[PDB]
């Protein structure tokens, strides 16, 4: 091998996140959204102005989908909730491991059919405690079981392949899908075996050409893979506990990257105060805006 691109981007938000995750962009308002999972915060950044707002949640949100200009869907440890964007009022939409207090939600992403894929996990990453679910029109269907840390959920440009990983295993899987529903039409196949290679495969996006861009926890990097699964580049970022990328900007042509301070000792934070910050890379990407969730 991958070509290394040292960081030449910028800091989008100087506030450090304990566990920055789940970033997404609303092109209609020009606003990036992400979570601070463990602190129950939903962060809002208006890009053009740099105006930052932090919204307190009664649960650990980990994924956000737009429904309309007035409504969003939030996946959390306590279920799936509708959020009114004007008032911030939250209303239960569907249960999601709502009777499993030992688990929380993690990585999730919208399929172009309007269905959400969302991962869950034991709060201590208990082996095999997690799953990946499909949510469409409030109906929840389990897709994959026995996953310790679900991650890297994303989809090919035509909606016909899904990708995911168990971060504890680091074998990125591909799944053939029905593009009209986002449901699998075949079993998962190993696409990228990165087992034993340093760092954990965390959140991913898939660009307009079908390349996967994966945040690598512990390596301060976003790794890019071509459509054969070759590792062609590594884009360095200052926060080493890299968690997730997102396409941002008016042409979905910039890349936002969240990071985390979780577990890091005080000396580590002192040595690198950029742990946990939210960045933009210096390079162009050819992205796509996230699909809307269909009620
Ligand atoms: Cl160009
Ligand atoms: K739960």
Give yes or no for a contact between 73 and 82, defined as CB atoms under 8 angstroms apart. yes
**Which residues, 6 or more positions from 147, have their beta carbon under 8 angstroms from its beta carbon?**
119, 121, 128, 130, 131, 132, 166
Stated resolution in angstroms: 1.5
Query: Whole-angstrom Cα distance, residue 101 to residue 144?
Result: 20
Query: Whole-angstrom Cα distance, residue 208 to residue 196?
Result: 29
Tokens 């990328």 belong to which residue? 245
| Beta strands in 95-170, from DSSP E residues, in sequence order | 103-110, 116-122, 130-136, 139-147, 150-155, 161-166
Half-sphere exposure of 191 (CA within 13 A, CB side): 23
Which residue(s) pair with 63 in the sheet? 75
Which residue(s) pair with 225 in the sheet? 212, 231
Ligand 1 centroid distance, CA of 145 (Å): 41
**Which residues, 6 or more positions from 266, have their beta carbon under 8 angstroms from its beta carbon?**
none
Tokens for 171?
A: 């074998």
Q: Is residue 207 annotated as a catalytic residue, yes or no?
A: no
Query: Whole-angstrom Cα distance, residue 221 to residue 233?
Result: 10
Ligand 1 centroid distance, CA of 164 (Å): 29
Q: What are phi and psi of 39, to 5 degrees?
A: -100, 5
Catalytically annotated residue among 202, 207, 251, 267: 202
Compute and round to an integer the Cα radius of gyration of the chain: 17
Measured between alpha carbons, how far is residue 234 from residues 5, 45, 153 in Å?
6, 26, 19
Tokens for 174?
A: 């591909």
Which residue(s) pair with 258 in the sheet? 244
Binding site for a divalent metal cation, by residue number, is 21, 151, 202
Tokens 């026995």 belong to which residue? 146
Query: Whole-angstrom Cα distance, residue 213 to residue 225?
Result: 7
Q: Which ligand is in closest contact with the Cα of 75?
A: 2
3-state secondary structure of 61: strand
Tokens for 141?
A: 């269907």
Query: Whole-angstrom Cα distance, residue 182 to residue 198?
Result: 32
3-state secondary structure of 128: coil
- Domain 1-295: give its CATH superfamily: TolB, C-terminal domain (2.120.10.30)
Q: What ranges do the domains of the chain cover?
A: 1-295
Q: Which ligand is in closest contact with the Cα of 208?
A: 1
Give yes or no for a contact between 150 and 156, defined as CB atoms under 8 angstroms apart. no
Binding site for substrate, by residue number, is 104, 106
Measured between alpha carbons, how far is residue 195 from residues 25, 158, 183, 219, 230 in Å?
31, 28, 27, 15, 14
Ligand 2 centroid distance, CA of 132 (Å): 13
Give yes or no for a contact between 61 and 44, defined as CB atoms under 8 angstroms apart. no
- Helices and strands (H and E) in the chain: how many: 1, 25
Tokens for 129?
A: 């405690």
Query: Whole-angstrom Cα distance, residue 23 to residue 33?
Result: 5
Query: Whole-angstrom Cα distance, residue 179 to residue 159?
Result: 5
Which residue(s) pair with 109 in the sheet? 117
Tokens for 18?
A: 């304990």
Binding site, by residue number, is 21, 104, 106, 151, 202
């Amino acid at each position: 091998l991958a070509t290394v691109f040292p960081f030449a981007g910028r800091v989008l938000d100087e506030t450090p996140m304990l566990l920055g995750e789940g970033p997404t962009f609303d092109p209609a308002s020009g606003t990036a959204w992400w979570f601070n999972i463990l602190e129950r915060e939903l962060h809002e950044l208006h890009l053009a102005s740099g105006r930052k707002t932090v919204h307190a949640l009664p649960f650990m949100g980990s994924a956000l989908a737009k429904i309309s200009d007035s409504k969003q869907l939030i996946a959390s440890d306590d279920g799936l909730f509708l959020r009114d964007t004007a008032t911030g009022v939250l209303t239960l939409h569907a249960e999601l491991e709502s009777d499993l207090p030992g688990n929380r939600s993690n990585d999730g992403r919208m399929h172009p059919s309007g269905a959400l894929w969302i991962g869950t996990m034991g709060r201590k990453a208990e082996t095999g405690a997690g799953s990946i679910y499909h949510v469409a029109k409030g109906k929840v269907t389990k897709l994959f079981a026995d996953i310790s840390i679900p991650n890297s959920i994303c989809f090919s440009p035509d909606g016909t392949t899904g990708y995911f990983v168990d971060t504890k295993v680091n074998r990125l899987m591909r799944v053939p899908l029905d593009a009209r529903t986002g449901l699998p039409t075949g079993k998962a196949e190993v696409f990228i075996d990165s087992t034993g290679i340093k760092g954990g495969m965390d959140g991913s996006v898939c660009d307009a050409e079908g390349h996967i861009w994966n945040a690598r926890w512990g390596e301060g990097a976003v790794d890019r893979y071509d459509t054969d699964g070759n590792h062609i580049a590594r884009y360095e970022v200052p926060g080493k506990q890299t968690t997730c990328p997102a396409f941002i900007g008016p042409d979905a042509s910039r890349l936002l990257v969240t990071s985390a301070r979780e577990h890091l000792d005080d000396d580590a934070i002192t040595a690198n105060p950029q742990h946990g910050l939210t960045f933009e890379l210096g390079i162009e990407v050819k992205g796509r805006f996230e699909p809307l969730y269909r009620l």
